[PDB]
Write an enzyme that holds these catalytic residues in place. Structure first.
Site, PDB file in Angstrom:
ATOM      1  N   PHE A 170      51.344  26.727  34.179  1.00  0.00           N
ATOM      2  CA  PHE A 170      52.111  25.672  33.500  1.00  0.00           C
ATOM      3  C   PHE A 170      53.422  25.410  34.217  1.00  0.00           C
ATOM      4  O   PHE A 170      53.865  26.227  35.026  1.00  0.00           O
ATOM      5  CB  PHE A 170      52.428  26.076  32.058  1.00  0.00           C
ATOM      6  CG  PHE A 170      51.220  26.208  31.181  1.00  0.00           C
ATOM      7  CD1 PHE A 170      50.499  25.083  30.795  1.00  0.00           C
ATOM      8  CD2 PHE A 170      50.810  27.455  30.713  1.00  0.00           C
ATOM      9  CE1 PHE A 170      49.384  25.198  29.974  1.00  0.00           C
ATOM     10  CE2 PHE A 170      49.698  27.575  29.888  1.00  0.00           C
ATOM     11  CZ  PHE A 170      48.985  26.448  29.521  1.00  0.00           C
ATOM     12  N   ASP A 197      49.261  24.734  14.591  1.00  0.00           N
ATOM     13  CA  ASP A 197      50.235  25.840  14.590  1.00  0.00           C
ATOM     14  C   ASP A 197      51.633  25.409  15.065  1.00  0.00           C
ATOM     15  O   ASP A 197      52.331  26.168  15.751  1.00  0.00           O
ATOM     16  CB  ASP A 197      49.716  27.001  15.460  1.00  0.00           C
ATOM     17  CG  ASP A 197      50.447  28.304  15.207  1.00  0.00           C
ATOM     18  OD1 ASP A 197      50.689  28.661  14.037  1.00  0.00           O
ATOM     19  OD2 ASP A 197      50.777  28.982  16.191  1.00  0.00           O
ATOM     20  N   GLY A 253      57.091  36.602  27.868  1.00  0.00           N
ATOM     21  CA  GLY A 253      56.500  36.705  26.533  1.00  0.00           C
ATOM     22  C   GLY A 253      55.170  37.428  26.492  1.00  0.00           C
ATOM     23  O   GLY A 253      54.539  37.664  27.524  1.00  0.00           O
TER      24      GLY A 253
HETATM   25  N1  LIG Z   1      63.599  33.433  26.982  1.00  0.00           N
HETATM   26  S1  LIG Z   1      62.203  33.554  26.172  1.00  0.00           S
HETATM   27  O1  LIG Z   1      62.438  33.183  24.706  1.00  0.00           O
HETATM   28  O2  LIG Z   1      61.688  34.991  26.253  1.00  0.00           O
HETATM   29  C1  LIG Z   1      61.018  32.454  26.879  1.00  0.00           C
HETATM   30  C2  LIG Z   1      59.667  32.794  26.977  1.00  0.00           C
HETATM   31  C3  LIG Z   1      58.749  31.900  27.543  1.00  0.00           C
HETATM   32  C4  LIG Z   1      59.168  30.648  28.025  1.00  0.00           C
HETATM   33  C5  LIG Z   1      58.263  29.731  28.595  1.00  0.00           C
HETATM   34  C6  LIG Z   1      58.631  28.934  29.687  1.00  0.00           C
HETATM   35  N2  LIG Z   1      57.703  28.024  30.218  1.00  0.00           N
HETATM   36  C7  LIG Z   1      56.472  27.920  29.688  1.00  0.00           C
HETATM   37  N3  LIG Z   1      55.449  27.139  30.028  1.00  0.00           N
HETATM   38  C8  LIG Z   1      54.438  27.394  29.207  1.00  0.00           C
HETATM   39  C9  LIG Z   1      54.842  28.335  28.361  1.00  0.00           C
HETATM   40  C10 LIG Z   1      54.063  28.837  27.394  1.00  0.00           C
HETATM   41  C11 LIG Z   1      54.476  28.823  26.059  1.00  0.00           C
HETATM   42  C12 LIG Z   1      53.660  29.345  25.051  1.00  0.00           C
HETATM   43  C13 LIG Z   1      52.412  29.882  25.366  1.00  0.00           C
HETATM   44  N4  LIG Z   1      51.982  29.896  26.704  1.00  0.00           N
HETATM   45  C14 LIG Z   1      52.811  29.373  27.716  1.00  0.00           C
HETATM   46  C15 LIG Z   1      56.105  28.679  28.642  1.00  0.00           C
HETATM   47  C16 LIG Z   1      56.961  29.564  28.095  1.00  0.00           C
HETATM   48  C17 LIG Z   1      60.529  30.324  27.913  1.00  0.00           C
HETATM   49  C18 LIG Z   1      61.441  31.217  27.351  1.00  0.00           C
END
Ligand SMILES: NS(=O)(=O)c1ccc(-c2cnc3[nH]cc(-c4cccnc4)c3c2)cc1
EC number: 2.7.11.23
Length: 344
Positions: A105, A154, A33
């Site tokens: 994380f 949010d 992301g």
């Molecule tokens: N397949 S996807 O929709 O592109 C996607 C992206 C990030 C994550 C993801 C997985 N583990 C995570 N742990 C922490 C986050 C996160 C979420 C939002 C902002 N910062 C970190 C985080 C995000 C999971 C799936």
């Protein structure tokens, strides 16, 4: 021409590269992301022997300071919550690397918008919606701990992740626009679909803005579409009024932004202002009918499925109405919400 000895780009982001190894520890896998804050990558931690999500903040002072406040909130949460049982994503640690603040994380699965997309925006069942509602109410009860008093500010489907694709566990992410309770510094907060009346009206606000958001979120999980899909603030208030009627006079009397949406007649009552270029009258788009309490759920698609009787739908309707109470002082709180018949 060159930013951070070639490591960064013009937009202050780290140029993420497949297979790079950081500090002889983290093997970078892929970009998952991007945000205004910076980027998020999937990586494998070779010391702990597990997959992690690394949030790579932009190399610039404005985002570095923002991220530091997030790091303070998570370490404060980690202090109170040692057993990792209140449904917030765990911050394992953080470190500086090539002039970027990086936050480590736990790796979870995809978000609740992705789940809605995978249903073709038709929604999930009431059995699964109940399980997400329970964990989210438990999460808000944790944030309402007096020594914390954290407002997420949010909450939306994008910021709710599933732990594992094949289980019902969820976690709340992204406390970058979050704060502890206090004096008002900000008025333009929350994403528009999930924004409370008190924020739209320019009035005082507290932790109850997250409970309003949750109410909007739970109907969307079951129906598959946003409850209130405003294209602007004026459209947002009008769609809220379609469902819940005109806000109480004594709130609109105090609201500094009341006249952006309404107008006060000679008789002392408030009416909707006209638009340039088709709304149903106040309170006629009933939630009873949106949910389809007597007609087999959203789009009639739940007729005959277990856990979708008229009695089950009325328990859900009632809980959601208490979350969408106009007055933040009488809107239901996390503790009381958990004691509802819908969870019994
Ligand atoms: N397949 S996807 O929709 O592109 C996607 C992206 C990030 C994550 C993801 C997985 N583990 C995570 N742990 C922490 C986050 C996160 C979420 C939002 C902002 N910062 C970190 C985080 C995000 C999971 C799936």
């Amino acid at each position: 021409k060159v930013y951070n000895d070639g490591y960064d780009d013009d937009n202050y982001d780290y140029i993420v590269k497949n297979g790079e190894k950081w500090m002889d520890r983290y093997e970078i896998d892929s970009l998952i992301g991007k945000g205004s804050f910076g980027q998020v990558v999937k990586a494998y931690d070779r010391v702990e022997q597990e997959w992690v999500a690394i949030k790579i903040i932009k190399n610039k002072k404005a985002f570095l300071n923002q991220a530091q406040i997030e790091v303070r909130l998570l370490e404060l949460m980690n202090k109170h919550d040692t057993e990792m049982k209140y449904y917030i994503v765990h911050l394992k640690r953080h470190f500086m690397f090539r002039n970027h603040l990086c936050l480590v994380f736990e790796m979870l699965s995809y978000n609740l918008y992705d789940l809605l997309r995978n249903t073709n925006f038709r929604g999930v069942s009431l059995n699964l919606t109940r399980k997400f509602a329970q964990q989210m109410c438990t999460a808000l009860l944790f944030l309402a701990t007096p020594e914390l008093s954290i407002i997420h500010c949010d909450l939306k489907p994008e910021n709710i992740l599933l732990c594992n694709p094949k289980r019902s566990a969820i976690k709340i992410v992204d406390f970058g626009s979050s704060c502890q309770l206090g004096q008002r510094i900000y008025q333009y907060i929350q994403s528009r679909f999930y924004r409370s009346p008190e924020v739209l009206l320019g009035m005082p606000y507290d932790l109850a803005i997250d409970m309003w958001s949750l109410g909007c979120i739970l109907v969307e999980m079951h129906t598959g579409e946003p409850l209130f899909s405003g294209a602007n603030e004026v459209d947002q208030m009008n769609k809220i009024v379609e469902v819940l009627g005109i806000p109480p006079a004594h709130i609109l009397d105090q609201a500094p932004k009341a006249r952006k949406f309404f107008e006060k007649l000679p008789d002392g009552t408030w009416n909707l202002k006209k638009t340039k270029d088709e709304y149903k009258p106040p309170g006629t788009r009933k939630l009873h009918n949106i949910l389809g309490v007597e007609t087999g759920g959203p789009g009639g698609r739940r007729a005959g499925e277990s856990g979708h009787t008229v009695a089950d739908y009325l328990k859900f309707k009632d809980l959601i109405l208490r979350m969408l109470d106009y007055d933040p002082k009488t809107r239901i709180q996390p503790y009381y919400a958990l004691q509802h018949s819908f969870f019994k």
